[PDB]
Design a protein around this ligand. Structure first.
Ligand SMILES: OC[C@H]1O[C@@H](O)[C@H](O)[C@@H](O)[C@H]1O
Ligand SMILES: OC[C@H]1O[C@@H](O)[C@H](O)[C@@H](O)[C@H]1O
Ligand SMILES: OC[C@H]1O[C@@H](O)[C@H](O)[C@@H](O)[C@H]1O
Ligand SMILES: OC[C@H]1O[C@@H](O)[C@H](O)[C@@H](O)[C@H]1O
Lengths: 103, 103, 103, 103, 103
């Protein structure tokens, strides 16, 4: 079991870590058919998504995806500093896999 | 995959991108028979709803609707500035499809 | 579709609007068998309940009832001003059908 | 229909009202096997639990149990004054049936 | 029934209490496959996880796992002082079974 976001991120193919150390600049949410998703942006121009849950994803996956959207919304609204994001680069915008917060 | 609310809204028919750059003026919620709606209003007069899901709604759609109503209530309570809304304009009041928050 | 709580409230029999423009004074909740209800009070003496759903209540009603208890709890804790309540006056305490919040 | 916590408490056997008029001193929660419970304490030494649900417990009661733990956590975190607690005194520690919050 | 985290923790083998009396230094969350988990750390170098749910986990166990993650996030964001943690010490990082929060 990884004990940090960098090592967790490295367990997967087509991932990379972004180190932001900054609050979220914008939060976008859609319930539109086939776009049940969330997009956040940082003031440096970086844009990321929380991907739509897939065709019958398992229970743990669907719960974590909803948890991550919960987390980004509350982080944005409270101006909580985001330390790092682990994202999949085979999507556009890059898709969030994990987030770390410190400070 | 759209990277912002304007491009997302343009992927659907019968939608309008609506710019606000303002906090929600009032939040209304109902639990009454087939009116389990949320209504939000803004200072300059605009009025929007989160439409009640019908009897064929799939799980992903129901979950996203529930999420949006959560988002509107917390945005309202925190006086978070709403940048834009993407709304369906063939219903009255217009029905929210997406929301962007910034500033 | 109604565009404000007054007009929504008027679509039902045995309802009425109360205009509080004040924060909630007390919040009560129970998990006791058959009384899974919430009761709120205002400093002017008014008392209102969120009625227990019955054994035939469909899922969309149940979810709205739970949402309203969530809303009342968070308003109470944050001292958010309640503008109006739409209530059924054929129950005691009067039963909440809808709520509006505005500064 | 009870209009307050005291009257509601009186509808059940093996209950009593505690009048704290104080914020929660400590919040404890467990996910351990057979002990999926919450414990709260006050500065005067009183200790109460949110009981583990029974095997037969129906959905509405389970939902209310989960709600009460939500309530105690946020009451604790916001230092919200707890007015009264309705508890079952045939358990140890005494188990929460209802709570009232007021200043 | 245990009346405090220390006694609760002693009911299980391979557990220990950490007395931290300190806020969480960092909060990490992941939705990645096989890694639906949360990791918290303290400024003394202690690192803890909320284990990935088991594929056959019962309902009460799954909900408590979800609740614990909700608690850790809100404790983190509000700088709530964590009093003690009850952890399974046959996991690496040590896995949270119970948390106590006090002032
Ligand atoms: O679990 C979700 C992941 O699924 C992978 O197969 C895909 O490459 C990633 O982009 C991400 O979507
Ligand atoms: O939907 C709940 C409402 O249902 C009505 O039929 C009843 O008259 C009201 O008192 C309220 O209970
Ligand atoms: O509904 C929960 C309550 O159920 C009663 O039967 C029991 O006597 C109480 O101790 C409490 O467990
Ligand atoms: O219930 C969760 C616990 O399950 C036990 O079997 C295990 O030994 C502990 O380390 C922890 O995983």
């Amino acid at each position: 079991t990884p004990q940090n976001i960098t090592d967790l991120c490295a367990e997967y193919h087509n991932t990379q870590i972004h180190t932001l150390n900054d609050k979220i600049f914008s939060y976008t949410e859609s319930l539109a058919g086939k776009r049940e998703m969330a997009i956040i942006t940082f003031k440096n121009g970086a844009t990321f998504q929380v991907e739509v849950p897939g065709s019958q994803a398992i229970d743990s996956q669907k719960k974590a995806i909803e948890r991550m959207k919960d987390t980004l919304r509350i982080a944005y609204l409270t101006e909580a500093k985001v330390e790092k994001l682990c994202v999949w680069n085979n999507k556009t915008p890059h898709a969030i896999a994990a987030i770390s917060m410190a400070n």
